[PDB]
Amino acid sequence: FQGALKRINKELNDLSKDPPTNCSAGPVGDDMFHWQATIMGPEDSPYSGGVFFLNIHFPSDYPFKPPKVNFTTKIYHPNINSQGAICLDILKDQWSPALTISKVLLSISSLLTDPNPDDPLVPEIAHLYKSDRMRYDQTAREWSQKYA
């Protein structure tokens, strides 16, 4: 998309002018299609105080295809797997070119507060979330401390 860079520039400027709460992101190096992000664990969650890094790759077709967002920090969450993949609706079928990386980051932060156990990337964690929520919560706390 001859116009993807202009849009990533628009978004860089606005994540700068009006940043998402408990989040930051920006380019890494001379490669504008490659961002990194930091998300602070939300306080009303077992991720509280944890500091999570994310890798972002904008597709050549951006904003028509969603960014590919991966956690680089290890994390115990039913919608996030070993490779850092995030099962999030707006990264998949609910993407629109009218969405922004800021909105993506805020939805990820909401996902940390409110997991979706019924659309899991990790079945065992999802099951523990539904059946013994404090076991999941304690582990999420342990992992936040060890890895984040």
Residues facing 71 on adjacent strands: 54
Residues facing 7 on adjacent strands: none
Q: Are 71 and 86 in contact (CB under 8 A)?
A: yes
Q: Are 122 and 80 in contact (CB under 8 A)?
A: yes
Instruction: Retrieve residue 111's tokens.
Output: 């996902």
Write the DSSP symbol of residue 89.
Answer: G
For strand 68-71 and strand 34-40, is the pairing parallel, antiparallel, or unpaired? Answer: unpaired
| Sequence letter at residue 19 | P
- Name which of 92, 110, 89, 91 is nearest 101 in CA terms: 91
Instruction: Retrieve residue 69's tokens.
Output: 């967002």
Residues facing 27 on adjacent strands: 35
126-140 burial: b if 16+ Cβ within 10 Å, else e: bebbeeeeeebeeeb
**Cα separation, 77 vs 16, whole angstroms:** 29
Element housing 24 (H / E):
strand 23-27
Residues facing 86 on adjacent strands: 80
Q: Are 111 and 140 in contact (CB under 8 A)?
A: no
> Which resolution in angstroms does this entry have?
2.0
Active site positions, annotated: 87
Superfamily of domain 1-148, CATH level 4: Ubiquitin Conjugating Enzyme (3.10.110.10)
At residue 115, the 3 state secondary structure works out as: coil
